[PDB]
Write an enzyme that holds these catalytic residues in place. Structure first.
Site, mmCIF file in Angstrom:
data_model
loop_
_atom_site.group_PDB
_atom_site.id
_atom_site.type_symbol
_atom_site.label_atom_id
_atom_site.label_comp_id
_atom_site.label_asym_id
_atom_site.label_seq_id
_atom_site.Cartn_x
_atom_site.Cartn_y
_atom_site.Cartn_z
ATOM 1 C CG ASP B 25 -1.759 0.799 1.625
ATOM 2 O OD1 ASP B 25 -1.874 1.802 0.943
ATOM 3 O OD2 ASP B 25 -2.441 0.567 2.601
ATOM 4 C CB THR B 26 1.981 3.510 -2.621
ATOM 5 O OG1 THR B 26 0.775 3.702 -3.372
ATOM 6 C CG2 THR B 26 2.701 2.349 -3.314
ATOM 7 N N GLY B 27 0.074 4.182 0.145
ATOM 8 C CA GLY B 27 -0.508 5.364 0.731
ATOM 9 C C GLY B 27 -0.461 5.371 2.203
HETATM 10 N N1 LIG Z 1 -11.576 1.907 -0.620
HETATM 11 C C1 LIG Z 1 -10.735 2.866 0.024
HETATM 12 C C2 LIG Z 1 -10.471 4.100 -0.605
HETATM 13 C C3 LIG Z 1 -9.652 5.075 0.025
HETATM 14 C C4 LIG Z 1 -9.115 4.806 1.300
HETATM 15 C C5 LIG Z 1 -9.386 3.571 1.937
HETATM 16 C C6 LIG Z 1 -8.911 3.311 3.351
HETATM 17 N N2 LIG Z 1 -7.452 3.287 3.635
HETATM 18 C C7 LIG Z 1 -7.016 3.785 4.838
HETATM 19 O O1 LIG Z 1 -7.760 3.830 5.797
HETATM 20 N N3 LIG Z 1 -5.788 4.275 5.054
HETATM 21 C C8 LIG Z 1 -5.382 4.512 6.477
HETATM 22 C C9 LIG Z 1 -4.058 3.932 6.863
HETATM 23 C C10 LIG Z 1 -3.769 2.591 6.558
HETATM 24 C C11 LIG Z 1 -2.531 2.002 6.866
HETATM 25 C C12 LIG Z 1 -1.558 2.794 7.482
HETATM 26 C C13 LIG Z 1 -1.827 4.154 7.779
HETATM 27 N N4 LIG Z 1 -0.754 4.973 8.225
HETATM 28 C C14 LIG Z 1 -3.086 4.720 7.490
HETATM 29 C C15 LIG Z 1 -4.918 4.751 3.939
HETATM 30 C C16 LIG Z 1 -5.476 6.063 3.355
HETATM 31 C C17 LIG Z 1 -5.130 7.198 4.307
HETATM 32 C C18 LIG Z 1 -6.136 7.828 5.082
HETATM 33 C C19 LIG Z 1 -5.808 8.852 5.977
HETATM 34 C C20 LIG Z 1 -4.465 9.240 6.112
HETATM 35 C C21 LIG Z 1 -3.439 8.624 5.359
HETATM 36 C C22 LIG Z 1 -3.775 7.603 4.448
HETATM 37 C C23 LIG Z 1 -4.420 3.743 2.949
HETATM 38 O O2 LIG Z 1 -3.397 4.423 2.293
HETATM 39 C C24 LIG Z 1 -5.464 3.221 1.993
HETATM 40 O O3 LIG Z 1 -4.822 2.297 1.192
HETATM 41 C C25 LIG Z 1 -6.619 2.500 2.663
HETATM 42 C C26 LIG Z 1 -6.308 1.087 3.278
HETATM 43 C C27 LIG Z 1 -7.538 0.202 3.476
HETATM 44 C C28 LIG Z 1 -8.144 0.093 4.757
HETATM 45 C C29 LIG Z 1 -9.335 -0.648 4.927
HETATM 46 C C30 LIG Z 1 -9.911 -1.281 3.801
HETATM 47 C C31 LIG Z 1 -9.311 -1.189 2.529
HETATM 48 C C32 LIG Z 1 -8.125 -0.451 2.373
HETATM 49 C C33 LIG Z 1 -10.183 2.600 1.290
#
Ligand SMILES: Nc1cccc(CN2C(=O)N(Cc3cccc(N)c3)[C@H](Cc3ccccc3)[C@H](O)[C@@H](O)[C@H]2Cc2ccccc2)c1
Lengths: 99, 99
Positions: B25-27
């Site tokens: 996950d790049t984000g």
């Molecule tokens: N469908 C969808 C669209 C957009 C966002 C998400 C939800 N996500 C998150 O909650 N994140 C918190 C996250 C996940 C892991 C580590 C950290 N540090 C934070 C971040 C996005 C993010 C939000 C807020 C601040 C920074 C980044 C991550 O980069 C994303 O890949 C997914 C990871 C994920 C979680 C649950 C189910 C599917 C996928 C889902």
């Protein structure tokens, strides 16, 4: 270009005459933009994330220009901390992950 | 390898003697893994995403293998529905994202 991951991969997008910066996100299935005036035409939707669902609105068929790259798909706008380009649009830009 | 983003980029980790799959996950700047049996001591930490914040336990200096590539780093373990490999490990196994 080739992004290393020492730093969050951000990119500038243009979207409905507005310039933003957004995270390139491979774990995100959906693009999510923080609140914006998009003209439309949206349905509601909820997505889940880490610890919780948000209510988001689905706009479809929105031109985004991400770097020099025009693409169109669904964006959802909603109360996100950070704007995120997931794989519905990363596949149009032809993004790849390599390790 | 090179993965395109037509489906979720999921790879097998081995961690704690256990086999799991995780998202690349790049984000995400941190790695967050569903609840599992890892030894050690750990500290409380709270992390936020879409939806809000989870409190996870934090473990440090943990050996992960992600495809055939070992990594040592901090792993947060906690309520998530998906195990995420985030930028801190991703940097170590040398992932890049290219478009
Ligand atoms: N469908 C969808 C669209 C957009 C966002 C998400 C939800 N996500 C998150 O909650 N994140 C918190 C996250 C996940 C892991 C580590 C950290 N540090 C934070 C971040 C996005 C993010 C939000 C807020 C601040 C920074 C980044 C991550 O980069 C994303 O890949 C997914 C990871 C994920 C979680 C649950 C189910 C599917 C996928 C889902």
């Amino acid at each position: 270009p080739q992004v290393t991951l020492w730093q969050r991969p951000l990119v500038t997008i243009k979207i409905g005459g507005q310039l933003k910066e957004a995270l390139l996100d491979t774990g995100a299935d959906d693009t999510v933009l923080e609140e914006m005036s998009l003209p439309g035409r949206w349905k509601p939707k909820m997505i889940g994330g880490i610890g919780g669902f948000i209510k988001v609105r689905q706009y479809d068929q929105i031109l985004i220009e991400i770097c020099g790259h025009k693409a169109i798909g669904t964006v959802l706008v909603g109360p996100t901390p950070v704007n995120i380009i997931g794989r519905n649009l990363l596949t149009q830009i032809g993004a790849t992950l390599n390790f």
